[PDB]
Amino acid sequence: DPFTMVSVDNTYQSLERELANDDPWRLDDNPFERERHTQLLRLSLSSGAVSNGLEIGCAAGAFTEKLAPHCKRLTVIDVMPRAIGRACQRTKRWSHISWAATDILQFSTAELFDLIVVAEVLYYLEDMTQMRTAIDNMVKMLAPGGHLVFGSARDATCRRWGHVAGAETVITILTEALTEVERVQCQGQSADEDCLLARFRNPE
Numbered sequence: 001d002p003f004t005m006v007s008v009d010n011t012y013q014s015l016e017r018e019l020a021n022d023d024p025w026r027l028d029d030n031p032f033e034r035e036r037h038t039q040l041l042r043l044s045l046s047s048g049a050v051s052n053g054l055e056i057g058c059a060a061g062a063f064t065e066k067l068a069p070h071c072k073r074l075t076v077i078d079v080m081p082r083a084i085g086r087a088c089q090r091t092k093r094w095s096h097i098s099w100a101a102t103d104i105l106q107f108s109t110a111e112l113f114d115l116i117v118v119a120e121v122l123y124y125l126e127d128m129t130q131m132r133t134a135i136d137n138m139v140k141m142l143a144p145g146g147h148l149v150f151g152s153a154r155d156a157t158c159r160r161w162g163h164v165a166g167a168e169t170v171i172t173i174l175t176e177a178l179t180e181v182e183r184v185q186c187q188g189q190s191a192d193e194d195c196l197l198a199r200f201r202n203p204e
């Protein structure tokens with residue numbers, strides 16, 4: 001069925017607009033987003049407590065808040081300063097969270113993480129060369145036994161949203177460097193609410 005979304009000149013403005021909503025991306029108020037988060041957290045916790053976690057793309061901190069109590073240390077990156085601002089207010093009781101306003105394309109640490117969560121973010125990149133670059137970066141920052149928990153709207157949905165690729169395409173690329181340990185589908189009320197999540201292990 002046909003649908004309507006806000007229309008902007010670039011991805012920065014798209015992000016900035018959602019981050020100015022009371023509930024960005026409806027991540028608090030949408031039962032589908034809550035169920036997605038349940039799956040995302042179930043996958044993240046599959047191996048128990050995390051030593052050094054990374055969250056890539058935090059919106060207003062809805063998932064950060066669910067993840068934080070289970071990581072000894074948590075780092076959170078987001079290309080939008082407004083996302084860091086909203087999320088760190090949400091998680092203020094925790095003293096073990098670090099933040100950086102950076103694009104995943106530009107993020108370079110010597111840090112290795114035993115969990116990287118990358119959900120509903122990689123389709124904002126402009127093309128497949130950027131996705132690969134970001135994926136290589138994520139693979140590089142995985143600890144020798146660590147897991148990567150990925151989630152995304154499907155390819156078709158992503159293409160309807162004006163983006164280049166979604167879940168199936170990224171899973172394919174992820175699989176060249178990493179070992180798939182599990183996956184889950186997540187479906188809501190419409191074609192737009194149809195998500196694939198997969199948990200990958202670093203064969204290392």
Ligand SMILES: Nc1ncnc2c1ncn2[C@@H]1O[C@H](CSCC[C@H](N)C(=O)O)[C@@H](O)[C@H]1O
Nearest residue numbers: 057058059078079080083103104119121124
């Ligand atoms: N290239 C990029 N690098 C880092 N963060 C990005 C980014 N492109 C978009 N983002 C951020 O990714 C977030 C997407 S909303 C998804 C949030 C969370 N992962 C969840 O599943 O609920 C926003 O905070 C947006 O600002």
